[PDB]
């Protein structure tokens, strides 16, 4: 009954529209960020979730008071009864904030009238990445955050800690299927707006795609249709239906496997680095099947080798046997080179 | 106004948090539904949706009224101002009033005390599907409610006469299914609370097979008849043998496939899985006879045609 | 400050919960419909989606006045405060009432007491569906609504201009993709409940399918799957490994073709036309396939035509030429007079 | 000084009544309007609407909130927004729409000396946009959002772009996976209904399609795919099952680009300009199997050879000119 | 405007008998089909609102149905009162009334 | 008892106009919509026009359009209908009914026969 | 006897503060917590979680809801929950969880005489799971509910399970399309944050997957894929077209089945069991192909031989394959 007498005294009078300090100083709100949890990764969509707990801290002189405790932990609820930031993120596209049993929020109210006020978030912030060296691809995805309506003359976000130190991330909390969280670098910038200059708190974290994933379900596959090709170059030059099918079907499941490498990723006119290798391997098989028109265009006996002028070996076969698995080697080992070195 | 002042009157020093007769004996509830129509059945996620106005009637003492007039008929504003029992769907796995254009609540107080209490339930119940007779399965899909918090020495349900006033069938959204059977039952169930009387409509409704003839069984016979084929066909034709019987096995397995897709995750064998099985097993047995052609044609175009409907009878029957 | 006045003595002892003419009269609600957009028919799920300006309006004794201005425009927030119909949608199914910027309702008080109050919903009604013509199916979907817990000798529905001129579409507003709106037909009727007798009024939306989608997408394929089984009779009867591999192509084509078409339906447990039309057309690719084996069982020599013995011309095949065309454009024209002819 | 502020703004809100409109019974409120669009993303053209998340900002002069005695401009919490009046704007095109709520609503009220009121929303909207795909990918999408006051007339309220053109901002810096924002309208009407004549703004963006896209996913296949029919050509007659094989599954797959391509799309009656190409592909592709068709009629029925030589070379001129006159009018 | 068309133009009744009327409308009118009675030199009256439903203070041999279109007006038996004409009117779009249909001895 | 009081026959000859009235006591004015019928000796009832008596706003027929002007008077509580241009072809009985719904006209009134030669 | 318990809970809830836990500013609350789960809606490895339904009943003391008077347990209704004090518990794997409201709250409140207050939700859950699929299908996830307080450290709030392990029921009776729980585990931690430290009771299960539909889907089509390739063994070397189609054949739908399989499952980086022994028959499909290759170009470019090895070494070593796989794997 003590501490009812005096959160009682702490809230008459407290008019919660009004900023501390309004039309005296800026409000300094130093934030800290642990992620409990890096949410997976949609490529599809340009946007990762994350699930924080947001700390914020800021000195309300209003709510300073003098007590037998030093510290207030109370309810959620009194959260909604004294002013908080109205703190929003630039990029988030649908953000969640849990409440189940109860608001996850705590609000602990210091003596000398500090507020620690964190709740835990699910955030859907959007991360605009540049597809072009995809899947070798490297994403500095932002979690920008700010006071919505308060300018740098009402409201300034600082770090409590300093940078990187700010920024915390759980041990185990990684949710990334297909990234791997490098690390992350903490910065502030000033962005102008249409209804003012506005203090936006920015922190890169960085992804890096791990491509065993689309080395399985892409790249596996599209190297196994082409060496599928070429199997028909040690194929017989009499045999017509077999090597034919042989060249259709290797060209028409590199079109199957075009169109579904391209499910996977947005919709974006880049053509990224898995689109240059399936290309470049659609134009192995397709080369592959008019090496094979080619040779049927001068297959004049018609008839395979049996135990009555049989057709010879070809040259331009026996030429390709070699050429054409030399050059396709050179060319993943040009293109791994390339992607792989460049960061 | 008259009907303002004993309505007024009425919630005058009313207790909304206490039941009827609390700690004096239980209270009875009478429950009536009336079905507008059964959602369609998602076997996938094993539930089904159900649209109901689910009325619910109890004496309450302090909701006696003598006057000129009988019966006052309210809207749903009186809903949150009187005890209202806190009636539950234990298998219900979401579930939604309507609230359009207003909340879709009827509430009637007789002179005598009696209340009735109205309202549309859109209410996602789950109906844990056995299939392993689908789709010639049959299920008896529950809708248990009871109160959440009020053991049975305190709330009771008992059906009314009119327990449940079910619908015009025909514009029912059981596309698959068809209404077979109403039964309903009261039980008293034991809970670490307590224990609660529960209350369970019992909908029996039987699956109707001519959507799965068409859709699955008629394509995969045809498939089968096209295995078939390849005995006809001269066994000299090498390329023409293979394709046939490898294009048979191909397009068995794709349709195998989309089948389970459709269907849920379940740890078992259904019937439709067990038929498409059967003529895998036909198709690649073709293919296997054209292998051991190659390195008794006769005999298996008449041998095949028999087993097939064989086992189609005895498919059938069980 | 003098409308302000008006509006606290009409809500002044007002009974939110007792409808106008309590114990009186019945309270005749006179509706409106102004269909802002006929949203997309949903036939998978046998409901289609309206978005409405569904107007009501009734005289209520309680809210007369006398000010400087005969109509009082408010917004949503006074309607909260003044008894409104419980109107609701005998086959509605989780329609939706919009809320930005603001809750899209008006209400307009006239000084004689006679009220004028609007709403923006999108409603997802039911609509019970007989597809045995479709995809030549004409429907009229309808829209009941009424009041929950009022029976007729409580609350009656009636249309605010002739029944004709009741309901408005507008131009521009036609969301239909694979339907036409041909119009719309209102009646008032009652129904037997439980509880009562409830007035109900029915409008009923004449939708007519637009069969073009289905025409490029499910009958030229079929056609041009029957005609690629034709091509097989055209062919030469000894190219077995050919004939046999369009044949089987064009079986297993409808057979997906087939499935395509039921995925894009609701379940039913009868047959609707498209159903049929694939229906013939898999007997007419399935009788080519059975009329290609019957041709080879009498290919007496497996050589082919060179220009020793050679093979006649098949008899069935040349019959086939003539009849196959003959029987499916004699088919076709059946089963487009048919439905097409019906109104 | 927090004190003079407090009061200033309790004065404010004691007494006003959020039933009445700036004005009312008087001269329509001038409610200007200013939008930074903050994405236009996910543009769907099965559900016909797109998804556009916006700091809308509408500004209104309120006399009831006109003070003197502060110099600042007064930046309220946004739950003031609740106890004041606020245009009852809706976009008639809005299927599902939010305003976003983490950490705190994110809405805006700053009132000015002057009585001015800058109220603003972060809005994500699904609006909708009817798009005329017949000329799609190759097409011009005029989609708009229909801004408007619900039961204000327009002799109670009043609309007007806030800076004409430059009342729109950021719209230069979206980046779209498929679009080009070439231009957009704003454009001020008054609609009349049944109840009355409202006042209307529109905001029309012309969204061009990026073709490069499509292209790479549903021209070039389909090109290729019928070059590998013209393969056809070159095979020697005798061989039909190899011929037949090719013409079958080339067809065959086209049909099946169609489908599948035609699934991702709503169910239009209309043929599209994707439609258009396709089914010429097809023609194409259909022809090459008749051709093959007609050289086995004559052989089983050197001039079988006749045709092969002119079709080897006709072929690619005649896909060709129909490429040319495709692109020609959709270019 | 809508056409509303009586066949028997004109038919005589055996008092006491049972006599059926008819009334015929161009296109839909639901319901919204009203029969009223007019006596030589006297104003219509009202006799069976709606496709079914009767006016109040009317005879219970008076009773009438009807579809979407056709619709139909039946006494029980006639009276020496029954004389007049009868009429059928709709309201489903702006009012057309029918030619008439008279009743004699 | 709801009654409408029409006026009496009026003697007039071609190319004047006439006034007439209809007057009702039992029920409100304003409540309900007035409609103007006129029967052709020995033909069918012929609708002519109707106005709301509140807002005064009318619908005529197109075949009348222009022909008859209808008003109202709240205080008076009756309904006008003024015909311009009268012909021999306009000799007619008129009645003024009552709407009470859109499912019948409730009251009528006892007729005006119109005269002109 | 109504009078006297409403006059009961109205001096109970009077001056009641729902901000303060019990012994504020003294030892910590003592809250016990019982749980008896419903269902387990499914388990989404995509998602990496699981949808869970459940009874969650915490009891535990608050002196000022302590009465006397009348001798009963007070069931009071829900909307009562609202006006007292709770523990702030929440669960750190949840993603998306709700409770439930038709035709109320579907929550309890039972206050006892001694102050014990019994509180009950019916909560819908949807935990996340991070999965270990380096051995799936064949692979034991226990996946885990953390039930923690938020606001309040260890020194303001404890966790218990009112019976060590009868405080979960009803796992026994749970029904999963896709898994068997072979174990449930009840324990109680202390976890530290930069905060402070909490207390935190974790219910594992561990489910175990049921490989029988598995078996159906993926393992019994990839061993009919490979032993039909196997039938190319049989067939004479001048048969290259039906060969090469069914190896071709055989090759490509493998690779469907792969990549078909792997569309179903998240995009994981790491192997799978799946995937080595999807990979295995990929290795000997692609072999037989590159066995008939081999024949090829021995007798164009002793093969009735190396076809006679073929057909007993392929069988005997993919067997040996399969008894290594699942004893690494099954034992
Ligand atoms: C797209 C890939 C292919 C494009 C290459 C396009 C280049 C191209 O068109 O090749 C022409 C020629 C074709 O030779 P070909 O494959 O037909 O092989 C022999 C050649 O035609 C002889 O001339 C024939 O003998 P003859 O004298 O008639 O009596 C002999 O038949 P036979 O007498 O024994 O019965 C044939 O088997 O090959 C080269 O000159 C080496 C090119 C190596 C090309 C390799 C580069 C990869
Ligand atoms: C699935 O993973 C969870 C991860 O939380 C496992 O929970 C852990 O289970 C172990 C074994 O019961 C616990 O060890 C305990 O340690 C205390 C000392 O601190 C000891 O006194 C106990 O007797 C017990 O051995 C551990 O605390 C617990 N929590 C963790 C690791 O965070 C769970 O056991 C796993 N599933 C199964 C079926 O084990
Ligand atoms: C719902 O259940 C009850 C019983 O469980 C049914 O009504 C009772 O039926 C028994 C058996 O004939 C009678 O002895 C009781 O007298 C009945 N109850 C009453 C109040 O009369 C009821 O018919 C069931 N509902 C159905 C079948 O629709
Ligand atoms: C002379 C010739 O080249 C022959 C070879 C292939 C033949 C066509 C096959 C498909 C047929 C479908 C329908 O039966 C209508 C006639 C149809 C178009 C045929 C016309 C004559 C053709 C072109
Ligand atoms: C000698 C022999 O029997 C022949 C039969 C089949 C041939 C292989 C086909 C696929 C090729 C893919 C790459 O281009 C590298 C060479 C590659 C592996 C070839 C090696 C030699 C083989 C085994």
Avoid at chain 3, 272 to 300: G, H, P, Q, R
Avoid at chain 5, 62 to 86: C, K, M, N, P
Wanted: proline content about 4%; overall charge neutral.
């Amino acid at each position: 009954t003590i501490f009812t007498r005096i959160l009682d005294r702490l809230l008459d009078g407290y008019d919660n529209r009004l900023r501390p300090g309004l039309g005296d100083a800026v409000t300094e709100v130093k934030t800290d960020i642990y992620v409990t949890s890096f949410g997976p990764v949609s490529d599809t969509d340009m946007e990762y979730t994350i699930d924080v707990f947001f700390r914020q801290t800021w000195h309300d002189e209003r709510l300073k008071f003098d007590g037998p405790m030093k510290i207030l932990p109370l309810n959620n609820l009194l959260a909604s009864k004294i002013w908080t930031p109205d703190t929003f993120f630039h990029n988030g596209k649908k953000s969640v904030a849990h409440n189940m049993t109860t608001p996850n929020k705590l609000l602990r109210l210091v003596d000398n009238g500090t507020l620690l006020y964190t709740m835990r978030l699910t955030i859907h912030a959007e991360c605009p990445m540049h597809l072009e060296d995809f899947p070798m691809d490297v994403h500095a995805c932002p979690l920008k955050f700010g006071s919505y309506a308060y300018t740098k003359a009402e409201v300034i976000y600082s770090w409590t800690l300093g940078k990187n130190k700010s920024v915390e991330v759980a041990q185990d909390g990684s949710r990334l299927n297909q990234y791997d969280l490098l690390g992350h670098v903490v910065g502030t910038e000033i962005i102008r707006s249409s209804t003012g200059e506005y203090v936006v708190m920015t922190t890169h974290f960085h992804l890096k795609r791990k491509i065993g994933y689309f080395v399985i379900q892409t790249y596996l596959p599209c190297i196994m249709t082409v060496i599928l090709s070429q199997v028909s170059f040690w194929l017989n030059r009499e045999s017509v239906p077999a090597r034919t099918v042989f060249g259709v079907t290797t060209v028409l499941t590199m079109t199957t496997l075009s169109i579904s490498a391209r499910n996977s990723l947005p919709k974006v006119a880049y053509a990224t680095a898995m689109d240059w290798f399936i290309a470049v391997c659609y134009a192995f098989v397709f080369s592959a099947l008019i090496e094979f028109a080619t040779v049927n265009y001068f297959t004049k006996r018609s008839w395979a080798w049996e135990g009555k002028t049989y057709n010879s070996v070809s040259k331009v076969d026996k030429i390709s046997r070699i050429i054409f698995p030399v050059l396709f080697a050179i060319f993943n080992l040009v293109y791994w080179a390339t992607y792989v070195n460049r960061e | 106004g008259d009907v303002t002042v004993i309505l007024n009157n009425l919630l005058e020093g009313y207790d909304n948090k206490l039941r009827p007769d609390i700690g004096v004996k239980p209270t009875l509830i009478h429950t009536d539904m009336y079905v507008n129509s059964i959602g369609p059945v998602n076997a996938i996620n094993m539930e089904y949706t159900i649209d109901i106005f689910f009325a619910q009637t109890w004496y309450d003492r302090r909701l006696k009224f003598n006057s000129t007039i009988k019966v006052l008929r309210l809207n749903s504003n009186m809903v949150g101002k009187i005890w209202i029992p806190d009636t539950f769907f234990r298998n219900s796995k979401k579930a939604d009033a309507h609230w359009i254009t207003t909340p879709n609540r009827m509430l009637r107080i007789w002179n005598d005390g009696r209340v009735l209490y109205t309202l549309r339930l859109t209410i996602d119940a789950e109906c844990q599907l056995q299939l392993h007779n689908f789709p010639m399965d049959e299920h008896s899909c529950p809708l248990e409610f009871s109160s959440y918090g009020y053991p049975r020495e305190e709330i009771v349900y008992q059906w009314k006469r009119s327990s449940v006033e079910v619908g015009d069938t025909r514009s029912w959204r059981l596309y698959q299914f068809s209404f077979v059977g109403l039964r309903n039952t009261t039980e008293v169930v034991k809970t670490t609370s307590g224990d609660y009387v529960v209350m369970s409509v019992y909908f029996d409704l039987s699956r109707r097979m001519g959507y799965f003839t068409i859709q699955t069984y008629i394509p995969c016979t045809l498939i089968v008849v096209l295995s078939w084929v390849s005995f006809w066909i001269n066994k000299d034709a090498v390329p023409a043998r293979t394709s046939l019987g490898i294009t048979t096995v191909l397009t068995m397995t794709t349709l195998s496939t989309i089948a389970r897709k459709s269907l849920p995750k379940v740890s078992y064998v259904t019937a439709m899985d067990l038929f498409v099985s059967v003529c895998f097993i036909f198709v690649f047995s073709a293919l296997v006879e054209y292998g051991t052609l190659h390195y008794m044609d006769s005999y298996a175009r008449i041998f095949f045609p028999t087993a097939f409907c064989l086992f189609n009878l005895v498919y059938w029957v069980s | 400050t003098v409308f302000t006045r008006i509006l606290d003595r009409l809500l002044d002892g007002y009974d939110n919960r007792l409808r106008p003419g309590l114990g009186e009269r019945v309270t005749e609600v006179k509706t409106d419909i102004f269909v802002t957009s006929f949203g997309p028919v949903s036939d998978h799920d046998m409901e289609y989606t309206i978005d409405v300006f569904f107007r009501q309006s009734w005289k209520d004794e309680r809210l007369k006045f006398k000010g400087p201005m005969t109509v009082l425009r408010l917004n949503n927030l006074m309607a909260s405060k003044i008894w409104t119909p419980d109107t609701f949608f005998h086959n509605g199914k989780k329609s939706v009432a919009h809320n930005m910027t603001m809750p899209n309702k008006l209400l307009r008080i006239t000084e004689d007491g006679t009220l004028l109050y609007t709403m923006r919903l999108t409603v997802r009604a039911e609509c019970p569906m007989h597809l045995e013509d479709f995809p030549m199916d004409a429907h009229a979907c309808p829209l009941k609504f009424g009041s929950y817990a009022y029976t007729r000798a409580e609350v009656v529905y009636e249309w605010t201009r002739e029944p004709a001129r009741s309901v408005v579409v507008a131009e521009d507003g036609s969301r239909l993709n694979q339907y036409d709106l041909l119009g719309q037909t209102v009646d008032s009727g009652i129904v037997q409940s439980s509880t009562g007798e409830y007035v109900v009024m029915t409008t009923h939306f004449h939708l007519k399918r637009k069969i073009g989608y289905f025409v490029i997408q499910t009958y030229l394929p079929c056609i041009m799957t029957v005609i690629l089984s034709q091509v097989s009779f055209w062919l030469n009867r000894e190219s077995v490994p050919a004939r046999t591999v369009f044949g089987v192509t064009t079986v297993l084509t409808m057979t997906t073709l087939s499935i395509s078409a039921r995925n894009s339906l609701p379940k039913v447990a009868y047959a609707t036309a498209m159903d049929w039309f694939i229906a013939v057309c898999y007997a007419f690719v399935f009788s080519a396939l059975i009329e290609f084996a019957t041709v080879n069982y009498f290919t007496k020599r497996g050589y082919a035509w060179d220009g020793k013995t050679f093979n006649s011309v098949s008899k069935i095949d040349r019959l086939s030429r003539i009849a196959f065309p003959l029987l499916f454009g004699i088919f076709n024209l059946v089963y487009w007079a048919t439905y097409l002819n019906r109104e | 000084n927090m004190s003079l502020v407090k009061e200033t703004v309790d004065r404010l809100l004691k007494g006003y009544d959020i039933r009445l409109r700036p004005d009312f019974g008087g001269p329509p409120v001038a409610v200007g309007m200013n939008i930074d669009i903050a994405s236009i993303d996910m543009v769907s053209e099965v559900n016909m609407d797109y998804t556009l998340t916006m700091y809308f900002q509408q500004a209104w002069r309120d006399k009831r909130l006109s003070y003197n005695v502060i110099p600042l401009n007064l930046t309220l919490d946004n739950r003031v927004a609740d106890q004041l009046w606020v245009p009852d704007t809706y976009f008639l095109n809005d299927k599902k729409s939010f305003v976003h709520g983490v950490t705190v609503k994110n809405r805006m009220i700053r009132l000015h000396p002057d009585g001015t009121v800058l109220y603003g929303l972060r809005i994500t909207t699904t609006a909708a946009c009817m798009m005329d795909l017949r000329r799609y990918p190759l097409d011009e999408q005029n989609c708009t959002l229909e801004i408007e006051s619900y039961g204000y007339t327009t002799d109670d309220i009043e609309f007007y772009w806030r800076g004409d053109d430059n009342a729109v901002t950021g719209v230069t810096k979206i980046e779209l996976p498929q679009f080009s924002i070439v231009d957009y309208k704003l454009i001020t009407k008054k609609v009349v209904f049944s109840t009355g004549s409202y006042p209307r703004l529109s905001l029309s963006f012309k969204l061009k399609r990026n073709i490069g896209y499509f292209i790479l996913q549903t021209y070039m296949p389909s090109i290729l795919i019928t070059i590998l029919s013209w393969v056809s050509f070159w095979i020697n007659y005798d061989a039909s099952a190899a011929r037949v094989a090719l013409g079958i599954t080339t067809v065959l797959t086209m049909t099946t680009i169609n489908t599948h391509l035609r699934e991702t799309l709503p169910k239009i009656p209309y043929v599209k300009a994707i439609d258009m190409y396709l089914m010429g592909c097809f023609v194409f592709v259909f022809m090459a199997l008749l051709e093959y068709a007609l050289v086995n009629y004559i052989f089983f029925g050197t001039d079988v050879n006749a045709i092969d030589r002119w079709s080897r070379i006709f072929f690619p001129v005649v896909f060709s000119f129909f490429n040319i006159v495709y692109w020609l009018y959709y270019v | 405007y809508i056409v509303m068309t009586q066949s028997p133009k004109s038919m005589s009744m055996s008092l006491g008998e049972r006599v059926t009327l008819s009334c015929r409308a161009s296109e839909y009118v639901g319901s919204y089909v009203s029969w009223y009675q007019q006596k030589p030199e006297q104003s219509p009256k009202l006799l069976i609102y709606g496709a079914s439903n009767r006016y109040t203070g009317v005879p219970d041999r008076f009773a009438g149905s009807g579809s979407a279109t056709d619709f139909t007006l039946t006494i029980t038996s006639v009276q020496a009162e029954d004389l007049a004409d009868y009429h059928c009117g709709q309201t489903y779009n702006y009012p057309t009334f029918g030619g008439g249909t008279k009743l004699e001895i | 008892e709801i009654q409408l009081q029409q006026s009496g026959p009026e003697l007039v000859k071609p190319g004047t106009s006439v006034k007439v009235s209809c007057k009702a006591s039992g029920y409100s004015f304003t409540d309900y919509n007035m409609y103007w019928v006129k029967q052709s000796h020995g033909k069918s009832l012929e609708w002519i026009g109707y106005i709301d008596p509140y807002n005064a706003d009318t619908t005529y027929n197109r075949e009348f359009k222009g022909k008859a002007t209808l008003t109202v008077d709240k205080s008076s509580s009756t309904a006008f209908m003024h015909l311009n241009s009268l012909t021999s072809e306009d000799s007619a009985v008129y009645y003024c009914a009552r709407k009470r719904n859109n499912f019948y006209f409730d009251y009528w009134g006892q007729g005006t026969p119109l005269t002109v030669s």
